[PDB]
């Protein structure tokens, strides 16, 4: 996508892992090649520190979707509430 704050899981792409027809199907700053593969570097470091470059799929959390015991189980800049839910805005780019 557009840059390191764009988060996308390429494993599940149509046609197979890391395959694409558009830049939105590639993580971070990666873009779609002429042969239909994502190319480039998503971000440095990867994973990013907590903040807008941190990519995490909360749907898979062990306590249930969007449930947490620590803020590293929350996407982007989100943090763990006292009640054990991820909260705030992740801060990721839309594309």
Sign, CA torsion 58/60/66/70: negative
Contact 65, 59 (CB under 8 A): yes
**Among 18, 19, 37, 50, which residue interacts with Cl ion (rule: CB under 5 A)?**
50
Smallest separation (angstroms) from Cl ion to the CB of 14? 5
Question: Is residue 49 within the footprint of Cl ion (CB under 5 A)?
Answer: yes
Smallest separation (angstroms) from Cl ion to the CB of 41? 13
What residues does 87 pair with on adjacent strands?
A: 79
Binding stretches for Cl ion (CB under 5 A): 3, 5, 49-50, 93
């Amino acid at each position: 996508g557009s840059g390191p704050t764009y988060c996308w899981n390429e494993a599940n792409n149509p046609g197979g892992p890391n395959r694409c027809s558009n830049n939105k199907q590639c993580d971070g700053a990666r873009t779609c090649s002429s042969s239909g593969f994502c190319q480039g570097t998503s971000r440095k470091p990867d994973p990013g520190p907590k903040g807008p470059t941190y990519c995490w799929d909360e749907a898979k959390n062990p306590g249930g979707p969007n449930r947490c015991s620590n803020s590293k189980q929350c996407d982007g800049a989100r943090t763990c509430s006292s009640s054990g839910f991820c909260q705030g805005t992740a801060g990721h780019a839309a594309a």
